[PDB]
Design a protein around this ligand. Structure first.
Ligand SMILES: [Cl-]
Length: 124
């Protein structure tokens, strides 16, 4: 079984680019991060910052999670992110995503020792 921290990295980290450079980014990344294997994951955000910078959010601003838990943290800085969401043309096995690039604060849920991101809650 994948660890929670490892799953977060696979689903949400893309430090290799500064930003999505085209409309096909999400189609490509959703496939390669294995988020379309058996069904199309409907919504997924990638963060275009270093792993260290995202990990550091777990010692930034403590805020409530949407679900009412208290282990969420909001980045002090905006970060480059890409939101990927399925479009109406999407039909497994031919998933199709809209790519939306933005610079926004991220909110992550943190757990463990080391205390690291395990869920992507939202951007603001
Ligand atoms: Cl997400």
């Amino acid at each position: 079984k994948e660890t929670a921290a490892a799953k977060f990295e696979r689903q949400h980290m893309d430090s290799s680019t500064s930003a999505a450079s085209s409309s096909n980014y999400c189609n490509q990344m959703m496939k390669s991060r294995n988020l379309t294997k058996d069904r199309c994951k409907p919504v997924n955000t990638f963060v275009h910052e270093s792993l260290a910078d995202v990990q550091a959010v777990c010692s930034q601003k403590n805020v409530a999670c949407k679900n009412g838990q208290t282990n969420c943290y909001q980045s002090y800085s905006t970060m480059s992110i890409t939101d990927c969401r399925e479009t109406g043309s999407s039909k497994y096995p031919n998933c199709a995503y809209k790519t939306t690039q933005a610079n926004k604060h991220i909110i992550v849920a943190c757990e463990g020792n080391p205390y690291v991101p395990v869920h992507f809650d939202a951007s603001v």
